[PDB]
């Protein structure tokens, strides 16, 4: 029953996803709002603790007490230059507890501080409750994914987040390995198979090269940009619409925090529409000083606005190929991961770089990692008996 059941969790920087392998198929489980992915956000309010969509929806009104990006801190020391650099950009407080970072917030009128693993355990608890509501019984066995470049300390702190959340962690697997499992790339029989995973998410970009020699996975190279993702494309749209508002009304909206946020969320939505239509419309009632902002943007203009960012994704691809000592024609499979890989220009650039090659993209790219983890969790729980 419950003891023979196992889930796969993609614990992401900005979004998390949970899957279950049953009756010969993977089911990516929808949360209580019907979304197949949940924001990795935890809000602390005057009355409650919010996790996911409800936490992300009130981020504007409560920025000091809304924690996100815990994955950027997990397993790291406070003195780490990555932690020191990131802290300058977060609206929440990060404190030092014996060279270990803690996030400090106000909760039910009291000052409370949490380790990154305690923050990640609240996200993991939500993913566990989403699976339990779908299954009708508690599931406790889980496979949790991490980036391929995570060291031993980051992997141990992720397993600890799993323990705090009440999960029996069957294994901590690499995100590009879960993605290759999702496509069944470890079941092509004998002979070394070279796979490139192109992972473009909300806030990070990762390129991984794996060799799969008879079921055995080996990471040959990792490359990328930890501060490149979908949110940079939203911000380029925001800047365009702020300048268009200035041309139409001779008014600068950039300082009005509410106007910029409403425009940002509308830009994110318009960006997603541009992945399946050649134009998208913005319909913002009373954006600034009672002025409605009813406009549109073509996919061509959007591609121009983000042109330099899209092209920059090819430098880590070349870098990973040189570190792996492989030429382009030596790569057997190209796998797309992350919601931003749905952008047609991104796909065209990667396909032209690999000389017109087909891309593995039939599995929802923001769900492929959870899909593979769910597959591995079923195999692992079956062997445990």
The continuous run of DSSP H or E covering 313 comes out as none
Chain positions 290 to 349 lying near ligand A1ACZ, rule: CB under 6 A, are 338-340, 342-343
Q: Is 10 a catalytic residue?
A: yes
Task: For residue 229, give Cα distances in angstroms to 128, 203, 312, 354.
Answer: 27, 4, 11, 21
Q: Residue 142 — φ and ψ, nearest 5°?
A: -145, 150
Is 380:242 a contact under the CB 8 Å cutoff? no
- The least distance separating ligand A1ACZ from the CB of residue 118, rounded to whole angstroms, comes to 24
Joined together, the tokens standing for residue 300 give 């061509």
Say whether residue 69 binds ligand A1ACZ (CB under 6 A).
no
Site map (CB under 6 A) of ligand A1ACZ, residues 262-291, x = contact:
------x--xx--x----------------
Q: Is 345 a catalytic residue?
A: no
Say whether residue 230 binds ligand A1ACZ (CB under 6 A).
yes
Paired residues of 280 in beta bridges: 297
Chain positions 352 to 371 lying near ligand A1ACZ, rule: CB under 6 A, are 366
Q: Which range binds ligand A1ACZ by CB under 6 A, 28-36, 45-53, 153-161, 224-232? A: 224-232
Is 7:139 a contact under the CB 8 Å cutoff? yes
Say whether residue 202 binds ligand A1ACZ (CB under 6 A).
yes
Say whether residue 142 binds ligand A1ACZ (CB under 6 A).
no
Say whether residue 160 binds ligand A1ACZ (CB under 6 A).
no
Strands 141-146, 6-11: pairing is: parallel
**Which of 57-91 are b and which e, b meaning 16 or more Cβ less than 10 Å from the residue's Cβ?**
ebbeebeebbbbbbbbbbbbebeeeebeebbeebe
- The least distance separating ligand A1ACZ from the CB of residue 3, rounded to whole angstroms, comes to 33
Q: Is 27 a catalytic residue?
A: no
Task: Tell me which DSSP letter residue 360 carries.
Answer: B
Q: Which range binds ligand A1ACZ by CB under 6 A, 116-124, 138-146, 225-233, 241-249? A: 225-233
> For binding to ligand A1ACZ (CB under 6 A), which residues are involved?
15, 201-202, 229-231, 268, 271-272, 275, 338-340, 342-343, 366
């Amino acid at each position: 029953m419950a003891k023979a059941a196992a889930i796969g969790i993609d614990l992401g920087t900005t979004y998390s996803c949970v899957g279950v392998f049953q009756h010969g198929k993977v089911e990516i489980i929808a949360n209580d709002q019907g979304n197949r992915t949940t924001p990795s956000y935890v809000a602390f309010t005057d009355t409650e603790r919010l996790i996911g969509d409800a936490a992300k929806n009130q981020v504007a009104l409560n920025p000091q007490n809304t924690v996100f990006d815990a994955k950027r801190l997990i397993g790291r020391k406070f003195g780490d230059p990555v932690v020191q650099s990131d802290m300058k950009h977060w609206p929440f407080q990060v404190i030092n507890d014996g060279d270990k970072p803690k996030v400090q917030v106000s909760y039910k009128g009291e000052t409370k501080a949490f380790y990154p693993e305690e923050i990640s355990s609240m996200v993991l608890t939500k993913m566990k409750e989403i699976a339990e509501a779908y299954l009708g019984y508690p599931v406790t066995n889980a496979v949790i994914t991490v980036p391929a470049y995570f060291n031993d300390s980051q992997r141990q702190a992720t397993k600890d987040a799993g323990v705090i959340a009440g999960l029996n962690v069957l294994r901590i697997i690499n995100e590009p390995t879960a993605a290759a499992i999702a496509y069944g790339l470890d079941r092509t029989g004998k002979g070394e198979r070279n796979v490139l995973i192109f992972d473009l998410g909300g806030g990070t970009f990762d390129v991984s090269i794996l060799t799969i020699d008879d079921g055995i996975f080996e990471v040959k190279a990792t490359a990328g940009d930890t501060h490149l993702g979908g949110e940079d494309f939203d911000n380029r749209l925001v800047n365009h619409f702020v300048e268009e508002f200035k041309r139409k009304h001779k008014k600068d909206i950039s300082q009005n925090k509410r106007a910029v946020r409403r425009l940002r969320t509308a830009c994110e939505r318009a960006k997603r529409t541009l992945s399946s239509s050649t134009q998208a419309s913005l319909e913002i009632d009373s954006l600034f000083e009672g002025i409605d902002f009813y406009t549109s943007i073509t996919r061509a203009r959007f591609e121009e606005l983000c042109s330099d960012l899209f092209r920059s994704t090819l430098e880590p691809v070349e870098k990973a190929l040189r570190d792996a000592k492989l030429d382009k024609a030596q790569i057997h499979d190209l796998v797309l991961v992350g919601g931003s890989t749905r952008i047609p220009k991104v796909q065209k650039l990667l396909q032209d770089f690999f000389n017109g090659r087909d891309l593995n993209k039939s599995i929802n790219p923001d769900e492929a990692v959870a899909y593979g983890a769910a597959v591995q969790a079923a195999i692992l729980i079956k062997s445990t008996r």
